Amino acid sequence: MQERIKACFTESIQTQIAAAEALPDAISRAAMTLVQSLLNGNKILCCGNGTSAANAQHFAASMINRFETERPSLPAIALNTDNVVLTAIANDRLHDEVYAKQVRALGHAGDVLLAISTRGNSRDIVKAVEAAVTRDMTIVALTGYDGGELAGLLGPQDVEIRIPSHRSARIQEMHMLTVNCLCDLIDNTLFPH
């Protein structure tokens, strides 16, 4: 078990070191996008499945409540939290529209869709991006592996932060760190402390 645990931490450390070198520019661009949207009075809609759903909620809470400093609640909403809405939509033929329906209903031009997916192929995530585009929203996608379908649906004004890894557990861990570095940048820019 000891060896296994060490190998676990080592793979993580190696992934983070690889990421620290390759992701700074994308993370900075993503932060600029989020900050500008917020400054313009827009909101951030977030979505993800499974662990990615949890990472989306972590971003939402960091904005709505706080990350590390006392400042006003910032407008961010996770679209993977209302179990009534979710199980009701999935209780249909077009079950992959769970996120798309919410984006179409709530999204406004200037808003940002924070999409989180380890593999980037989930149909509900893809449809959410399609819906965001129909609402003139910008996309920030946290991905892994090869980016999947999601990476191929982003325009020049959108930002992909692809973790350099092909192991879901490591990618999800890196997504949490990514969200945290993003939150640190948002608050340092808008509410330094």
Added chain:
Amino acid sequence: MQERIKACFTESIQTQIAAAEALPDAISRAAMTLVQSLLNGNKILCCGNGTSAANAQHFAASMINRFETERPSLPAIALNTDNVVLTAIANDRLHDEVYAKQVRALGHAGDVLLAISTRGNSRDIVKAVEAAVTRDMTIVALTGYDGGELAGLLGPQDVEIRIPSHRSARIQEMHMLTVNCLCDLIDNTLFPH
């Protein structure tokens, strides 16, 4: 048990009959308020605690997904669904602002806050209403008993639908029916045919 069950249904029926006579006007006014907000491109924020939280989600899902008629998703969000955001806020001295923080962040002038409480005294609901007013939002309050503190915060443009009952179970049931008649009216007014 037979008699008890019959007394249970009897109380419900008597309450519904009393409500049918006294609530149509208020329900109609609330429907007009909700319809007007939606037509103006605004959204409906909803909140409640416990069973009232469930009632809030039912309204949100009926808007976001659908009620009965086939039409586009309407913008409604329940503020009592993101467990990460909620437990994060209630993790400190600020438990009473679980809803207020979300209203501060998301509420825009013209939006509506659908507040649901059987007694109308819960501090977090009172504060959500207070915050909504600060954001130039109209309030539609579903209450019971004497309306509580919530009732005292409403202005000429807000609408209170106070179930004539002093038993939370009956009030909660009447709130679901109320929400359902409101959904029927919203859909009949916006998408008739």
Added chain:
Amino acid sequence: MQERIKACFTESIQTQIAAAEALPDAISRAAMTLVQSLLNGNKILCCGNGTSAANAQHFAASMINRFETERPSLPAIALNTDNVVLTAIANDRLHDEVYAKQVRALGHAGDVLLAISTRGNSRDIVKAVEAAVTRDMTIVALTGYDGGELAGLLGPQDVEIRIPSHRSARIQEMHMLTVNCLCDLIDNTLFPH
């Protein structure tokens, strides 16, 4: 709008009157089943989609927290609340196993599955019942319309409470009342006040 609202309340009142005459025996049996399971130290797993998910949570909260009197927390769990688990399972080919997986993992002989469905045809609900049977659990199904597939999967020791209605909104309202009369019976039998 006034007339529409009145017709809404009238349909509800008529449904409740029809139910008060036809459901007492089934509700009593369901209550006996739930009480006996609890007395034997077992638990109640609950599941439903959409509004039914909300009704399931209402039962869970009434047991875990309280209904109307102060007594110990009773073991009831809604299987439609963990959004991470839900969106992760649905993020697969066997998406209809969202509830079944949880029942197989958590269910023990003697436990009860409280299944709520307006039409009784949802595949995830059907699979949850199949799983409960594999765990020697008893079933209490709150249904509507003709009972759908669900009604045809119940044995002699299981209990179906079929609302005499073919209108989802009315059925869901009646399910809440049914849960409340059930909770009143559970507490009157175990903790009278």
Added chain:
Amino acid sequence: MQERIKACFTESIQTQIAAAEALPDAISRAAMTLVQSLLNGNKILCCGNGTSAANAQHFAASMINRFETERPSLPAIALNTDNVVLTAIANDRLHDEVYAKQVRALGHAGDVLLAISTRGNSRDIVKAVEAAVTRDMTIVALTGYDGGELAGLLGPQDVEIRIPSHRSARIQEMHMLTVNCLCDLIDNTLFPH
């Protein structure tokens, strides 16, 4: 922003390196505790607030659905997911027992309570641990800083995994990694091949 992002990743990496040296033994002990409980037919109750709530759900979903290997659903439940139950409890004077009430109702001797808190002081977490001990449950606590009040409640059979850090963001990231290494061990021990 570039430098800030790099300092962000650097702190994470340094923390992971420190943790790799000091936590293997504790993680191994925790894994053995979790595996033993599961083998005995027991379940794992999980709880946390905010981001720790998200981490708790990740562990629960990895057990209930799956982590990486194809095997049966394992019994784990996060106590911070039913928003109706949570808001119902926190609707009164009893907000600090949101988790304790669930543990009282559901906990059996032999079960394990996976408690997650960066500081280990939150009253609702302390009370959940207190209640778990009352139900003869073993405790696996994921903490940070100095372990807080939580650390002081642990006995010889419980396991504390205290991340060597004084920054909640880093601790939360390390908790996800910790949970992932634990899941890997559980699956390697129970379903190797």
